Structure 1
Amino acid sequence: DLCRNTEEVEAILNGDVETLQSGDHGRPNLSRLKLAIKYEVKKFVAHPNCQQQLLSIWYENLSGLRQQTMAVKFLVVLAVAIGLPFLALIYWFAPCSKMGKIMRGPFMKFVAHAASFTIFLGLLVMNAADRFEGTFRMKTSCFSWMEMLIISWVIGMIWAECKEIWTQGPKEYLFELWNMLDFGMLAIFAASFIARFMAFWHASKAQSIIDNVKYYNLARIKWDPSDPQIISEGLYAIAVVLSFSRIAYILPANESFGPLQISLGRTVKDIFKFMVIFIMVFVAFMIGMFNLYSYYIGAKQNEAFTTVEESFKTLFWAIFGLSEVKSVVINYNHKFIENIGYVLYGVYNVTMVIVLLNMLIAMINSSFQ
């Protein structure tokens, strides 16, 4: 905090510039800053004296781009998304250039990666262009150009991760939320693609044979429940959800939604801590209700509390109010069990909706303070 000129700032932030070699052609040897980040000082880096140096490093060649508005930077990101193939083409042929040296800047790298992710999300959106407004297995199983582009993007992401796990090591790469979620998403995408490829392989064998061929000509209404196509579609949907979940990686960069995202994220640990007890009480009531209504499989008006899966589903949807009260009535004359179920369901609703949810709100407020 006491530094006055840039020489003292460099001495404190970087260290001995004589013994320490230059980090790059113009970098200030951020080794000590890396050490401070690793030690979670959290305030030696957030100080404005460190902030100005980090910002100056962030914009190496984009001196005038700092003063642009947010809309201008969004337009720049869109333009980079449009011209990414041109940038990739000119990177190999011209290593050093007026544009080539700019592309090597860290902010330009971040913009390029963000624009690539925007292109990937756009490809995911447009992969279903056939049914935006509305709506023989050889035709179904074959890949499209959009599908091939998505496959190439997934392979590139997987290879980039592999490079990172090689450059960091097993433990270093792992203990990180982005790394943990990017691995799950890529694994699910690979599973979907492998299932699609197996379906295509079976269809190609059937077409090569031209009985064992009648099954592959059946319509979707008569498809096998364990068909690889269905598994591929489900895994693809989950992978799309996870890919859009990955979009929060670059939001910390923005000043408008960075601190808000950090504040919301710091509450997730307490939410999980409360959800443990929530699941405990849920298991309690689920097993109680399942044991109560196990015998009346046909007497019940609906199958709400007949099996463990059904009881779990009914009690889960009771949290959001999507489960009705008729799931307690029994067509038989026995009102003892029906009223026992009424009392248990009422106690469950009071505990969950009123007590536990309000206490969760109070816990969230106390943490957010």
Structure 2
Amino acid sequence: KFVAHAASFTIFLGLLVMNAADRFEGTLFRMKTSCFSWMEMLIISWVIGMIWAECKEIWTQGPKEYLFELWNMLDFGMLAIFAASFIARFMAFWHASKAQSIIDNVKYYNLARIKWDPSDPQIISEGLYAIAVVLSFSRIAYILPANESFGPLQISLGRTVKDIFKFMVIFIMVFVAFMIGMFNLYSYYIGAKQNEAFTTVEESFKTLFWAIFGLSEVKSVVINYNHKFIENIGYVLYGVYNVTMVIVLLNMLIAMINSSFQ
């Protein structure tokens, strides 16, 4: 049974890889794009089987017992997104089906990708399907514990994640502190800055998050105007943010080393 279910999982991973095999090396009009290929048909069948397997699991285990395990929520989420992607794809298929059946209203579905609506179901389908594929690769956690060399690594990895989640409370508090502070400083200079950063709350969150991995430049503090007082305030707050973050990350690293030895 373990080999049969592990072999089924490896086929589903193989289908996901080979689904985009046409564009591995490189890449009405919307009628062609909407249709499902034979690879897509198998993937839909696998997802339906996974949903039914989850339904039987929730039926016998009970809603309370099933919901208590947090990893089952992750496995339920990836199947919901996979169903979400395919229904959005079908909506784009049916809308193009009406347009082709007619042959103005039909004008939209002849357009190329550059002119698509931002909320096109085709766009939503591809965005969700990318998330589902990433999440579907996380079902290896049901097969890794069997192996005697990979099982200990998963157990050790789970302990690391739980410890990091403990320190995320302090990390969040410092993150939100500077995110609001930096946003209040640069909200007025929306068009003055060299690059949009700390201008909006979403943009301030994005800049400070990527600053953790050193992927945010220092020029996000610079302003084009002559107001060097506010720019110097930004340099201090951004500099204090990095010092505080490396201190918090250093404290987390040392405390996790202790936890391993204790």
* Shorter-chain TM-score range: over 0.9
- Greater relative contact order (CA < 8 Å, ≥ 6 in sequence): 2
- What is the Cα deviation at residue 288 of structure 1? 0.3
- What is the Cα deviation at residue 222 of structure 1? 0.3
- What is the Cα deviation at residue 361 of structure 1? 4.5
- What is the Cα deviation at residue 368 of structure 1? 6.0
Question: Kindly tell me: are residues 365 and 112 of structure 1, through their superposed partners in 2, closer, same or farther at Cα, counting changes over 3 Å?
Answer: farther
- What is the Cα deviation at residue 260 of structure 1? 1.7
Task: Please give the alpha-carbon distance, in whole angstroms, between the structure 1 residues aligned to 2:106 and 2:257.
Answer: 59
Question: Kindly tell me: are residues 249 and 321 of structure 1, through their superposed partners in 2, closer, same or farther at Cα, counting changes over 3 Å?
Answer: same
Residue deviations 1:147-181 (CA, integer Å, cap 9, x gap): 00000000001001111111111111222233211
Matching residue of 1:253: 146
Q: Report the TM-score, using the length of structure 2 for normalisation.
A: 0.96
Task: Please give the alpha-carbon distance, in whole angstroms, between the structure 2 residues aligned to 1:357 and 1:318.
Answer: 16
Residue deviations 1:197-223 (CA, integer Å, cap 9, x gap): 101010111111111001000000000
Q: Does the 8 A contact of 2:15 with 2:39 survive in 1?
A: yes
Task: Please give the alpha-carbon distance, in whole angstroms, between the structure 1 residues aligned to 2:36 and 2:184.
Answer: 49
Q: Does the 8 A contact of 2:167 with 2:252 survive in 1?
A: no
Question: Kindly tell me: are residues 368 and 244 of structure 1, through their superposed partners in 2, closer, same or farther at Cα, counting changes over 3 Å?
Answer: farther
Task: Please give the alpha-carbon distance, in whole angstroms, between the structure 2 residues aligned to 1:140 and 1:364.
Answer: 52
Q: Does the 8 A contact of 1:154 with 1:186 survive in 2?
A: yes
Matching residue of 2:192: 299
- What is the Cα deviation at residue 273 of structure 1? 1.4
Aligned length: 261
State the secondary structure of the residue aligned to 1:266: helix
Matching residue of 1:239: 132
- What is the Cα deviation at residue 356 of structure 1? 2.9
Question: Kindly tell me: are residues 286 and 225 of structure 1, through their superposed partners in 2, closer, same or farther at Cα, counting changes over 3 Å?
Answer: same
Q: Give the one of 247, 251, 256 matched to 1:358.
A: 251
Task: Please give the alpha-carbon distance, in whole angstroms, between the structure 2 residues aligned to 1:139 and 1:132.
Answer: 20
Q: Does the 8 A contact of 1:138 with 1:204 survive in 2?
A: yes
State the secondary structure of the residue aligned to 1:290: helix
State the secondary structure of the residue aligned to 1:256: coil
What are the equivalent positions in structure 2 for 1:178-193 lying under 5 Å apart? 178-193=71-86
Q: Does the 8 A contact of 1:274 with 1:360 survive in 2?
A: no
Question: Could you list the runs of 5+ residues in structure 2 that have no partner in the other structure?
Answer: none
- Which is helix-richer, 1 or 2? 2
Q: Give the one of 133, 141, 156 matched to 1:263.
A: 156
Q: Give the one of 228, 239, 243 matched to 1:335.
A: 228
Q: Give the one of 104, 111, 116 matched to 2:3.
A: 111
Question: Kindly tell me: are residues 243 and 365 of structure 1, through their superposed partners in 2, closer, same or farther at Cα, counting changes over 3 Å?
Answer: farther
- What is the Cα deviation at residue 272 of structure 1? 0.9
- What is the Cα deviation at residue 325 of structure 1? 0.6
Residue deviations 1:214-266 (CA, integer Å, cap 9, x gap): 10000000000000001110110000000011222210110001012101102
Task: Please give the alpha-carbon distance, in whole angstroms, between the structure 1 residues aligned to 2:71 and 2:192.
Answer: 50
Q: Does the 8 A contact of 2:171 with 2:248 survive in 1?
A: no
Residue deviations 1:264-284 (CA, integer Å, cap 9, x gap): 102222211111211111000
Task: Please give the alpha-carbon distance, in whole angstroms, between the structure 1 residues aligned to 2:152 and 2:17.
Answer: 29
Matching residue of 2:106: 213
- What is the Cα deviation at residue 338 of structure 1? 1.1
Q: Does the 8 A contact of 1:271 with 1:360 survive in 2?
A: no
Task: Please give the alpha-carbon distance, in whole angstroms, between the structure 1 residues aligned to 2:6 and 2:56.
Answer: 19
Task: Please give the alpha-carbon distance, in whole angstroms, between the structure 2 residues aligned to 1:267 and 1:249.
Answer: 18
Q: Does the 8 A contact of 2:164 with 2:252 survive in 1?
A: no
Matching residue of 1:98: none
Task: Please give the alpha-carbon distance, in whole angstroms, between the structure 2 residues aligned to 1:205 and 1:368.
Answer: 66
Matching residue of 1:278: 171
Task: Please give the alpha-carbon distance, in whole angstroms, between the structure 1 residues aligned to 2:60 and 2:252.
Answer: 45
Out of 258-267 and 282-291, give the one that drifted further: 258-267
Larger Rg: 1
- What is the Cα deviation at residue 292 of structure 1? 0.6
Q: Give % identity.
A: 100
- What is the Cα deviation at residue 359 of structure 1? 2.8
Question: Kindly tell me: are residues 260 and 139 of structure 1, through their superposed partners in 2, closer, same or farther at Cα, counting changes over 3 Å?
Answer: same
Question: Kindly tell me: are residues 294 and 178 of structure 1, through their superposed partners in 2, closer, same or farther at Cα, counting changes over 3 Å?
Answer: closer
After superposition, the CA RMSD in angstroms is 1.3
Question: Kindly tell me: are residues 161 and 368 of structure 1, through their superposed partners in 2, closer, same or farther at Cα, counting changes over 3 Å?
Answer: farther
Q: Report the TM-score, using the length of structure 1 for normalisation.
A: 0.69
Q: Does the 8 A contact of 2:195 with 2:220 survive in 1?
A: yes
Task: Please give the alpha-carbon distance, in whole angstroms, between the structure 1 residues aligned to 2:260 and 2:68.
Answer: 24
